[PDB]
């Protein structure tokens, strides 16, 4: 048993969806604690070197970050291993590139370019309501954020809209049947659909039944269901409408692209 926490991470043990080459090396970046966890995040360096290709090595990323050339939720970050998660805001004013981090159908991270009208807020999921010191109510979110004195109408599992400049709630979408959702966990990551039914088993998980826009139906547990508006998404989403094609169609598309 290791006498303390773990500071390394073998490349072969890294999450599958990060898409890291087997021969790249023995080691891989180790994300640091922050807004999101290890298995629900991705480091900055991977976005800035293996995707956008603005850097070729660790050193270039170090210089770019320490020069303060990237903003996260309106705040410059200088850690190459800082974790980037879901429904976050990515801005690079030098090239005027604004992205919101969402999930693709295949179950991997993607950058959705956006406008200036909606980059001042983010959507977050509320999953804990509790009493703090002196008995003052609080709440928490999927990005490790705490807000004091919320409205009583807000309950757990809901979704909250908050300005980037100020962490003040603007509007909240309830968790109810007939609302569009985005799956964010397991075999169905990235699929968009509307709720149809809710079944609860005492002392265990709660299962949600949704129907895609084209009629496909699927299930998952309530711990990975995210609300994105009332019958219509509040934010801009990737080109495809959360439709997971079959193997035949993907093979056809690959053949066309080749």
């Amino acid at each position: 048993m290791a006498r303390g926490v773990r500071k390394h991470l073998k490349r072969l043990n890294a999450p599958k969806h990060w898409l890291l080459d087997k021969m790249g090396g023995i080691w891989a970046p180790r994300p640091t604690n922050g807004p999101h966890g290890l298995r629900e995040c991705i480091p900055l360096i991977l976005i800035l070197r293996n995707r956008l290709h603005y850097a070729n090595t660790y050193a270039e990323t170090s210089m770019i970050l320490q020069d303060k050339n990237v903003l996260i939720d309106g705040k410059p970050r200088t850690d190459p291993t800082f974790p980037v998660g879901f429904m976050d805001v990515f801005e690079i004013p030098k090239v005027h590139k604004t992205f919101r981090v969402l999930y693709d159908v295949k179950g991997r991270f993607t950058l959705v370019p956006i406008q200036s009208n909606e980059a001042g807020f983010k959507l977050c999921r509320v999953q804990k309501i509790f009493l703090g010191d002196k008995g003052m109510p609080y709440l928490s979110t999927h990005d490790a954020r705490t807000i004091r004195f919320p409205h009583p109408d807000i309950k757990t599992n809901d979704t909250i809209k908050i300005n980037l400049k100020t962490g003040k709630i603007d509007e909240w979408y309830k968790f109810d049947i007939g609302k569009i959702v985005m799956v964010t966990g397991g075999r169905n990551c990235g699929r968009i659909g509307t709720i149809q039914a809710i079944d609860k088993h005492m002392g265990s998980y709660t299962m949600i039944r949704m129907k895609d826009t084209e009629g496909t139906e699927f299930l998952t547990r309530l711990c990975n269901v995210f609300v994105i508006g009332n019958d219509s998404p509040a934010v801009a989403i990737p080109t495809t409408k959360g439709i997971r094609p079959d193997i035949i169609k993907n093979r056809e598309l690959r053949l066309r692209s080749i």
Binding site: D133, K134, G135, M136, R148, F149, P152
Partner: protein, 59 residues
């Protein structure tokens, strides 16, 4: 107690920037406390149709 010229640098001496720093810190602390107080008062004004339980300020 009351070529290059070498003399020790002084310590514990108060210069203006320290006075300004202390005054600013006091002002920020007072502002923070006032903001929390008014937020709590507004919240208590709200909740006119429910219940509350908080630590009363003694003294």
């Amino acid at each position: 107690l009351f070529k290059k010229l070498k003399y020790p640098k002084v310590q514990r001496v108060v210069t203006d920037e320290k006075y300004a720093r202390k005054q600013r810190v006091i002002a920020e602390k007072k502002e923070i406390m006032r903001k929390s107080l008014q937020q709590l008062e507004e919240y208590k004004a709200l909740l006119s149709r429910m219940g509350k339980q908080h630590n009363i300020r003694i003294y």
